[PDB]
């Protein structure tokens, strides 16, 4: 089957105009549409028929077909344009879409995690086991290390850690589980959550409470 | 105005059959094409399928193609997508989308195609201790998704629930956490509201210091 080909990221300064690229076989002889989706979201129609913008689209949405390529343009670019962008093609007989654009505006303040750690509660340890949770929210970049101590000593197993999530604000959210017995962690005096994020590392203490 | 609402989603096993629905209005339904739009989770759009005016014709992605049966009421403006022979490349989230280009969506509603068993989660609460942050554990379910909310939906703002892991055993976990002023933790009471279709799980759980 035929592919549509985006790049696979894009990065545009604030206030320059994003341009977003939509190449396959024949695509000057098709129609080219585009979709705004942001994390969470369903996708938003922005330009079809290679150059229409639906009612309620602003202008500063544009779409072009020339050469075997579709362009998305996208004027006065802010930060609440950071999004998915996929181009869709139909003709033809199949709809074929591209396998999408991020959108990154530089020029986002540097963010640091809140971050917060939570021991067992009462009702679980009762139930014979133990969960630690350790929240990283608001922070920017979306890359985050989460290390975990037992007292002093690092954990090597019963981690489990999500990727980063764009959140609505283009923040980033993130969190990690530590699995344990009760007596495990009872044993010690505590654990601690260690989150660095561009070199500059948080950290976090709870303790069983007795 | 328009509104396109989706029905149908859950578990089912491979290889065993599932139908959505999209319910609309806001428009004169059996003017438009209508179409199935799919979405597996951090990856990107696919169509799956379209529909003429009449219901008359139809076409299908290659993939889903024999598998999957479109179909509409235009009585009842209701869209249907009949998925059998169900393959574990089948987990998406489901969009229903209006006419030539999709210019209305639905929320979507998600599929997930396993061989394994729903699990209801277990909800534990996560006290706390200026600002003081308590919330919701929300432990080992199957599959997505979860809704978690504060005092029977009534508290809504400060309010953040993180998105979910996926743990090496293939059970999620997700938490939800609310700000608040440490000096209401005294005089005010907070509840989590949380539900978990596909197993009927329905938990309240009140955060206490």
């Known amino acids: 089957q035929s592919v549509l080909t985006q790049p696979p990221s894009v990065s545009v300064s604030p206030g320059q105009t994003a341009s977003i690229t939509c190449s396959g076989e024949?695509?000057?002889?098709?129609?080219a549409s585009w979709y705004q989706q942001k994390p969470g979201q369903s996708p938003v129609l922005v330009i079809y028929?290679?150059?229409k913008r639906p009612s309620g689209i602003p202008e500063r949405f544009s779409g072009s077909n020339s050469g075997n390529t579709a362009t998305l343009t996208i004027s006065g670019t802010q930060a609440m344009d950071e999004a998915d962008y996929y181009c869709?093609?139909?003709?033809?007989?199949?709809?074929?879409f591209g396998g999408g654009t991020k959108l990154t505006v530089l020029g986002q303040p540097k963010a640091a995690p809140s971050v917060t750690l939570f021991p067992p509660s009462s009702e679980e340890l009762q139930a014979n086991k133990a969960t630690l949770v350790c929240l990283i929210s608001d922070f920017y970049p979306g890359a985050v290390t989460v290390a975990w101590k037992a007292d002093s000593s690092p954990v090597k197993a019963g981690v489990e850690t999500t990727k980063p999530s764009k959140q609505s604000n283009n923040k980033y959210a993130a969190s990690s589980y530590l699995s344990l017995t009760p007596e495990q962690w009872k044993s010690h005096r505590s654990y601690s959550c260690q989150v660095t994020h561009e070199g500059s590392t948080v950290e976090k203490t709870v303790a069983p409470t007795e | 105005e328009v509104q396109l609402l989706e029905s149908g989603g859950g578990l089912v096993q491979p290889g065993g059959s599932l139908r959505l629905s999209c319910a609309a209005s806001?428009?004169?339904?059996?003017?438009?094409?209508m179409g199935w739009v799919r979405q597996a989770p951090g990856k990107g759009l696919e169509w799956v399928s379209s529909?003429?005016?009449?219901?008359?014709?139809?076409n299908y992605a290659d993939s889903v193609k024999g598998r999957f049966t479109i179909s509409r009421d235009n009585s009842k403006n209701t869209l249907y997508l009949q998925m059998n022979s169900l393959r574990a490349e089948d987990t998406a989230v489901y969009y229903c989308?209006?006419?030539?280009?999709?210019?209305?969506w639905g929320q979507g509603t998600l599929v997930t195609v396993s061989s394994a068993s729903t699990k209801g989660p277990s909800v534990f609460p996560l006290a706390p201790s200026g600002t003081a942050a308590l919330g919701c554990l929300v432990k080992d379910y199957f599959p997505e998704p979860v809704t978690v909310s504060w005092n029977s939906g009534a508290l809504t703002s400060g309010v953040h629930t993180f998105p979910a892991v996926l743990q090496s055993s293939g059970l999620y976990s997700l938490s939800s956490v609310v700000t608040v002023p440490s000096s209401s933790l005294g005089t005010q009471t907070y509840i989590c509201n949380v539900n978990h279709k596909p197993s009927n799980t329905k938990v309240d759980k009140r955060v206490e210091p």
């Open positions: 806001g428009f004169t339904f059996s003017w438009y094409v």
């Open positions: 529909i003429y005016p009449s219901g008359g014709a139809t």
């Open positions: 989308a209006r006419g030539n280009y999709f210019d209305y």
């Open positions: 024949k695509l000057g002889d098709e129609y």
């Open positions: 028929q290679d150059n």
């Open positions: 869709q093609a139909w003709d033809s007989s199949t709809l074929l």
